[PDB]
Amino acid sequence: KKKTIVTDVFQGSMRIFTKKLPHPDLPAEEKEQLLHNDEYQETMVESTFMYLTLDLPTAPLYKDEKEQLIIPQVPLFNILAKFNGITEKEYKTYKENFLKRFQLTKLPPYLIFCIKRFTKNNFFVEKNPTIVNFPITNVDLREYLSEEVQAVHKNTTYDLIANIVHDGKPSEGSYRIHVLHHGTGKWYELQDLQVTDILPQMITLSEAYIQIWKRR
Amino acid sequence: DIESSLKQLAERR
Amino acid sequence: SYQKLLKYYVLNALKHRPPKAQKKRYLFRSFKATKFFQSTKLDWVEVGLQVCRQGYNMLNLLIHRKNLNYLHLDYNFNLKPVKTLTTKERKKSRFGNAFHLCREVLRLTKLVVDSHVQYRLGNVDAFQLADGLQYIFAHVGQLTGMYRYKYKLMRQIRMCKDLKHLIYYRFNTGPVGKGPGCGFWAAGWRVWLFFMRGITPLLERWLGNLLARSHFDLELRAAVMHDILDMMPEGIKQNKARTILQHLSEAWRCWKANIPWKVPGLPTPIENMILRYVKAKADWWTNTAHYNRERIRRGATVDKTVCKKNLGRLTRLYLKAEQERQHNYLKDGPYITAEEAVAVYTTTVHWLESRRFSPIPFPPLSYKH
Amino acid sequence: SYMLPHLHNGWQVDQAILSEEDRVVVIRFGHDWDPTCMKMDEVLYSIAEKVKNFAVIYLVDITEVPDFNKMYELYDPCTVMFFFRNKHIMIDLGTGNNNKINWAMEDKQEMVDIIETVYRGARKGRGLVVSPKDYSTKYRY
Amino acid sequence: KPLPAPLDGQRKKRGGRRYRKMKERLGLTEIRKQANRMSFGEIEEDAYQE
Amino acid sequence: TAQCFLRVDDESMQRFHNRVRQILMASGSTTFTKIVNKWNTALIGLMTYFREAVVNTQELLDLLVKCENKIQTRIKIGLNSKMPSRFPPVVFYTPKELGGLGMLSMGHVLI
Amino acid sequence: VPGLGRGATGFDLNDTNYDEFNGYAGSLFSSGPYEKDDEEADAIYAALDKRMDERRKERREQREKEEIEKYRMERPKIQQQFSDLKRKLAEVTEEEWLSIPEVGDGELDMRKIGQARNTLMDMRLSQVSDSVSGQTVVDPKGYLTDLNSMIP
Numbered sequence A: 001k002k003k004t005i006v007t008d009v010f011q012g013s014m015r016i017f018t019k020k021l022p023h024p025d026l027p028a029e030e031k032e033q034l035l036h037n038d039e040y041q042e043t044m045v046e047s048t049f050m051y052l053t054l055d056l057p058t059a060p061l062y063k064d065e066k067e068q069l070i071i072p073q074v075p076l077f078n079i080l081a082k083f084n085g086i087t088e089k090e091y092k093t094y095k096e097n098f099l100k101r102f103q104l105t106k107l108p109p110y111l112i113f114c115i116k117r118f119t120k121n122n123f124f125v126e127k128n129p130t131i132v133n134f135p136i137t138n139v140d141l142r143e144y145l146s147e148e149v150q151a152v153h154k155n156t157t158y159d160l161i162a163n164i165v166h167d168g169k170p171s172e173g174s175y176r177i178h179v180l181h182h183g184t185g186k187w188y189e190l191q192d193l194q195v196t197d198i199l200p201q202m203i204t205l206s207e208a209y210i211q212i213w214k215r216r
Numbered sequence B: 001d002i003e004s005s006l007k008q009l010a011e012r013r
Numbered sequence C: 001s002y003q004k005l006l007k008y009y010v011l012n013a014l015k016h017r018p019p020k021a022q023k024k025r026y027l028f029r030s031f032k033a034t035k036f037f038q039s040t041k042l043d044w045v046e047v048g049l050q051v052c053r054q055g056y057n058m059l060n061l062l063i064h065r066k067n068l069n070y071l072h073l074d075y076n077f078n079l080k081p082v083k084t085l086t087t088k089e090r091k092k093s094r095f096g097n098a099f100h101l102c103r104e105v106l107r108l109t110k111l112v113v114d115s116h117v118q119y120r121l122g123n124v125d126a127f128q129l130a131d132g133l134q135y136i137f138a139h140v141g142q143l144t145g146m147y148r149y150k151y152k153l154m155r156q157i158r159m160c161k162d163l164k165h166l167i168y169y170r171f172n173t174g175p176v177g178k179g180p181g182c183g184f185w186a187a188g189w190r191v192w193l194f195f196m197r198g199i200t201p202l203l204e205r206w207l208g209n210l211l212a213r214s215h216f217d218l219e220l221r222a223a224v225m226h227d228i229l230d231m232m233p234e235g236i237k238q239n240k241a242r243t244i245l246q247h248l249s250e251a252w253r254c255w256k257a258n259i260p261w262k263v264p265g266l267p268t269p270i271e272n273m274i275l276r277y278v279k280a281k282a283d284w285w286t287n288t289a290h291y292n293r294e295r296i297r298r299g300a301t302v303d304k305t306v307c308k309k310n311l312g313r314l315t316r317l318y319l320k321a322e323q324e325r326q327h328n329y330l331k332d333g334p335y336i337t338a339e340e341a342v343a344v345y346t347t348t349v350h351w352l353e354s355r356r357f358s359p360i361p362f363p364p365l366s367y368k369h
Numbered sequence D: 001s002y003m004l005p006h007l008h009n010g011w012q013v014d015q016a017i018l019s020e021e022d023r024v025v026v027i028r029f030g031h032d033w034d035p036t037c038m039k040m041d042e043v044l045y046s047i048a049e050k051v052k053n054f055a056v057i058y059l060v061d062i063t064e065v066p067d068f069n070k071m072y073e074l075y076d077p078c079t080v081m082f083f084f085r086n087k088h089i090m091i092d093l094g095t096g097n098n099n100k101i102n103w104a105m106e107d108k109q110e111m112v113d114i115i116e117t118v119y120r121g122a123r124k125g126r127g128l129v130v131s132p133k134d135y136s137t138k139y140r141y
Numbered sequence E: 001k002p003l004p005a006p007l008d009g010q011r012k013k014r015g016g017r018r019y020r021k022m023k024e025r026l027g028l029t030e031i032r033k034q035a036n037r038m039s040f041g042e043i044e045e046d047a048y049q050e
Numbered sequence F: 001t002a003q004c005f006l007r008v009d010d011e012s013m014q015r016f017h018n019r020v021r022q023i024l025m026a027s028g029s030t031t032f033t034k035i036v037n038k039w040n041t042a043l044i045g046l047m048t049y050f051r052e053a054v055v056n057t058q059e060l061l062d063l064l065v066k067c068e069n070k071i072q073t074r075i076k077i078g079l080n081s082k083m084p085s086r087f088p089p090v091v092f093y094t095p096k097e098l099g100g101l102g103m104l105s106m107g108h109v110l111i
Numbered sequence G: 001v002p003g004l005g006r007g008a009t010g011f012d013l014n015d016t017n018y019d020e021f022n023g024y025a026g027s028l029f030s031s032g033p034y035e036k037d038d039e040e041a042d043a044i045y046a047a048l049d050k051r052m053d054e055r056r057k058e059r060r061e062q063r064e065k066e067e068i069e070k071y072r073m074e075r076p077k078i079q080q081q082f083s084d085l086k087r088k089l090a091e092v093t094e095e096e097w098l099s100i101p102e103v104g105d106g107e108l109d110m111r112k113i114g115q116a117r118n119t120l121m122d123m124r125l126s127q128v129s130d131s132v133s134g135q136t137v138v139d140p141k142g143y144l145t146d147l148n149s150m151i152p
Ligand SMILES: O=P(O)(O)O[C@H]1[C@@H](OP(=O)(O)O)[C@@H](OP(=O)(O)O)[C@@H](OP(=O)(O)O)[C@@H](OP(=O)(O)O)[C@H]1OP(=O)(O)O
Pocket: C135, C138, C139, C161, C164, C165, C168, C172, C177, C178, C179, C180, C181
């Protein structure tokens, strides 16, 4: 069934602009000659995304000389920049290079962000400690949609309603959730049988792992 | 000087 | 012996895998197709003697090619020195296990062929010949020094002895008692042929070769140095290599100390390469520190340097984690909720009031004690 | 890397041994790729400038310079050789042979003490010196 | 700083005079008896007090 | 009314084994006298703390005899690289005032 | 000049060149009387070896290629990992190389919310503590002055 409740609620349409790349270990003349091969150009691989996988920037390693904490801080719009349309994130499989440009074409009623924390390095798995600075009451995605696409959706203002947060080391980690209780305005943190009343301001401080936003 | 040894090491490894 | 024969039978029947599809290439057909080989019909004893002679000649050629004239090989394939060996000569005489294994194989062939020629001369009876073959195939380890050069061969030897225990105690029933007259050499001959099947490719590869014609950080540092100095102007790299090495060491030290590292005059490509190198070395450093701590805590044998280094690494890692924990406390605020804290405070004040506890005053200036 | 100076022929070696009169000449016979040589050369670079006053270190490739293989019994993957005023100094490490280290110690202080003892014994006049440690047992527990 | 080249000059050429104050600072006349002594025969204090 | 069977916790046994290992590794060039003094102090602390539990715990007794054999071994190897078959125990257990190491014993040693 | 020109006397057999199996590496007949007949013999024997390897050549080579491809994909050599930065490092002017020095030399503040919550908890604890009457406290300055006066 092409249209289920899961697809009707969470699935959206996104336009993948896959641009193949020549091998970097080639002369510049051959590099530009491969631009006429009609293989290393943007393609139309537009598909459906059930969730958005946001990739955090790597940890700053050395702490900044400023008085700020060693914990890195990145705004929500900065990680939500691979889907702006012009940003070109490198994709390199075995003996091949790409430039996967992403452009959203249909915004689902409930948007799912899957922030990438745990990455497998050469020896173990490291959890990215970057803190995402996101608002919890107004996010406008109109700038991430094509002009012919922006006209279709009247509403693009998203409110965060769910926030799954992972705490601790990658192995002995724990999962908690911040849920927005409608009817009221209270925000509640649930961890197993523990239900606490969290303040709306403190949600952005924790390491957001998964996020559910409502389009209104 | 250092590069001469680096090339020998890379070739042999 | 029965139990071990059953053990090896079961092991063969269980470790057995179906044979894999081939293209059916036959070695001897290819040999006949070339000009270097010719076919004839010969007695088995004659070809046994000829093979023994050819093996002796080929071993002589291999010995003399190394100019090791101080080692003499007899016709029974027993290699012995003729003089006290110099250390240089002793190292030159290290032929490896392959040469000795081939020599002992040729010695076993010499034994079998010599027993057969002894029977053919008429000195011994055919029963004596069969019994001698049984003894040879049951006492390869004693008659021939094979086990030292290939340890696995020892297993085969036990097989043969087990097979002897299987045959003798059935052969020696009734009127026949213990004696040297039992000739039944199918089992040991089978076992040694099956060993030869396995070891033929190894000796062929050795002869073809002989007749032809932990420290991840150091390697990481060397490789990044090679990569940087390749992309380096020739006329400037005299001292810039040392400067960038000093920069690499400083960056590693700065990461080890949780202090900012930002060289102003360093170009951003070299800076990014240094950052990547520090990241990789730090990942390896953390992983090897954790692995060494697990090894030491488990009880593995370690020297002082390892423990000292591990302690240092762990110290750095634990202070990194403690700084992270302090910053997390500062960011996420107090972990105790306000109402939780006031509940604890009310509990404490109720306890102390119930105890009628008088608070301890500031150390009095005229304190008697 | 290997910032320590290298000798590319026997001539470089045999005037390097005679170049130093008040400093102990240290020669590492081996191969850079050899890991054990890598450990020793890292240790030497860690102390290359610490012993600049009374010692000097040179790296010699066995393949590049194979003339000393027979005379110095250079059959190990790596050896360390100590000279002073054209005379070799034997060190009694307790390993059986006193002519060459033949192993890579991770602690740089052990090598510093070894070279200091060699210098003290060479300036005093003894051709054979005693290591201030026993290396027969690895001291691992 | 590089480690200075080890050397063994003459330990002392003359004595008396200031030399004595030198030792007085470090190496002054201690008890020099019954402190570095072991008393081969008997035991002081407890057996294995250490 | 009840019997309270005592034992030494495996954590304490591991601490004692680690202390013995530290004594063995931190020996290096130190005099045998100080090594034996450290072993004696460790043994005295263990026994004066776990008096009855040491007797009750068989695994602990095996651990102590193994560690004692290690300490003596260390001294022996220091004396000579070759293994001294039937080494005399008199050198170990003789009190320091009489020239020996003054080593305490917890295993069954037959002179 | 040989090694004896130093006037020294001794007081590939290297362990590296020796392997317990196959003995010492290196063919004993690397050089010798090589002519057209020797080349023909070597070609014939190499052809025989290739024919023998033809038994499982296709599947063996396929498995070898797959295994090496997966090994390289899973674990990349450090030179492969740093090749990207090495090539991105080429774009640098020679003037900047001389400029390399030595080692001789919106956004939300995370501290403010923590300080605010800490101050709130402190205020609550002080409000609760005001009900406690038995607490004792001395005047720091006053006590000190007395200490001052007490100095003989
Ligand atoms: O010469 P060994 O390798 O020690 O073998 C002998 C021998 O067997 P061989 O004839 O194969 O040499 C005897 O055999 P008999 O001549 O007496 O038949 C006898 O074997 P039995 O007494 O079992 O017949 C003996 O045994 P033991 O060592 O128990 O005296 C042992 O044979 P095993 O090595 O098979 O035991």
